[PDB]
Amino acid sequence: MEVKTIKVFTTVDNTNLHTQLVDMSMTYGQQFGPTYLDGADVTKIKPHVNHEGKTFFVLPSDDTLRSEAFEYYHTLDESFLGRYMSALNHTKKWKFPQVGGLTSIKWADNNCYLSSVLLALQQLEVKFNAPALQEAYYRARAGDAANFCALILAYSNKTVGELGDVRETMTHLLQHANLESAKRVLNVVCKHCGQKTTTLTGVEAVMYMGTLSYDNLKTGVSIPCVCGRDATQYLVQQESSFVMMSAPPAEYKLQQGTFLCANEYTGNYQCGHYTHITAKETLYRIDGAHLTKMSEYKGPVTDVFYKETSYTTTILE
Numbered sequence: 001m002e003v004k005t006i007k008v009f010t011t012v013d014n015t016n017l018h019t020q021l022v023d024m025s026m027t028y029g030q031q032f033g034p035t036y037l038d039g040a041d042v043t044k045i046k047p048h049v050n051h052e053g054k055t056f057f058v059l060p061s062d063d064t065l066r067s068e069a070f071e072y073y074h075t076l077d078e079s080f081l082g083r084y085m086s087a088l089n090h091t092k093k094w095k096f097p098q099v100g101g102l103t104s105i106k107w108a109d110n111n112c113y114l115s116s117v118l119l120a121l122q123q124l125e126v127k128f129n130a131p132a133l134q135e136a137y138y139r140a141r142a143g144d145a146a147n148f149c150a151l152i153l154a155y156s157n158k159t160v161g162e163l164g165d166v167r168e169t170m171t172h173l174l175q176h177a178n179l180e181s182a183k184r185v186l187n188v189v190c191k192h193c194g195q196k197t198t199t200l201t202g203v204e205a206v207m208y209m210g211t212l213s214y215d216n217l218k219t220g221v222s223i224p225c226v227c228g229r230d231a232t233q234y235l236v237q238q239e240s241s242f243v244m245m246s247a248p249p250a251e252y253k254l255q256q257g258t259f260l261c262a263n264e265y266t267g268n269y270q271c272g273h274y275t276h277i278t279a280k281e282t283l284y285r286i287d288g289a290h291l292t293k294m295s296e297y298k299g300p301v302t303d304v305f306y307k308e309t310s311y312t313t314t315i316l317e
């Protein structure tokens with residue numbers, strides 16, 4: 001007798017494993033729909049005896065599987081799982097060296113922006129509400145980051161090799177972060193329209209676009225008003241474990257002890273390369289696999305991260 005059937009497990013979350021008896025005369029596709037083995041699309045291949053007892057990813061095809069997928073990924077986007085697997089097939093071959101005490105990514109497939117994201121996340125006090133992200137994030141911190149990178153790609157709607165952006169990626173990722181108690185209060189004054197207090201929460205409480213300087217947001221920054229004038233606003237109150245300050249790329253000085261980490265961007269509207277700036281015993285520039293220690297830094301910066309707990313203004317009235 002030749003082996004005609006094998007037992008395997010199918011899953012959408014790598015946690016709930018569903019026993020299957022597989023017919024070796026049919027493709028995985030014919031039995032399960034689109035099917036993946038460690039990210040590789042095996043929809044078109046027939047089973048092998050060596051597949052016995054292995055775990056295969058499938059698409060959610062009934063209410064139970066859809067529920068398991070939503071519970072794990074916190075999205076109902078039907079294309080997500082396939083995009084995640086497509087990315088994973090490539091990110092499993094990336095290398096994740098320890099550089100300046102953090103898990104970085106050797107350069108591959110235009111992944112500089114993702115390396116800068118990964119490096120930043122390891123320094124923020126953040127957690128993810130989506131179990132897929134939180135579990136992968138834990139493993140990434142230790143050097144096992146292939147899965148986390150594939151997820152970031154999928155959550156970002158980026159494919160492997162696609163040119164990316166740190167701020168855009170952070171916007172997508174932070175939608176799944178623990179930011180429900182993040183709060184920002186801004187005092188806004190227009191000379192024509194008058195005064196108002198704006199309260200922002202969640203992602204909008206921690207991301208700002210217009211200045212790299214947390215000090216400037218505290219003391220006053222120009223902001224367009226609906227009337228066509230430039231109004232001024234400053235930070236009254238901040239409750240979050242960090243803030244991310246962004247601005248169109250320009251030369252900026254970074255001083256150890258005055259920020260947590262940052263993204264350098266060498267380039268312009270067309271093209272650019274993203275490197276990570278942090279500090280340990282001195283300033284560190286981490287460009288994939290490559291470290292440069294620095295005693296000072298003035299360079300082209302687009303995003304600066306700062307630690308926070310709770311801040312209240314000392315500006316009166």
Ligand code: NA
Pocket residue numbers: 131132133135136147
């Ligand atoms: Na995961």
Ligand code: NA
Pocket residue numbers: 205206207208243244245
């Ligand atoms: Na901010």
Ligand code: NA
Pocket residue numbers: 217218219234235236312313314315
């Ligand atoms: Na202030």
Ligand code: NA
Pocket residue numbers: 116117119120261262263275276277
């Ligand atoms: Na960064």
Ligand code: NA
Pocket residue numbers: 104105112115116119274275276286287288
């Ligand atoms: Na990097």
Ligand SMILES: [Zn+2]
Pocket residue numbers: 190191192193194225226227228229231
């Ligand atoms: Zn106005």
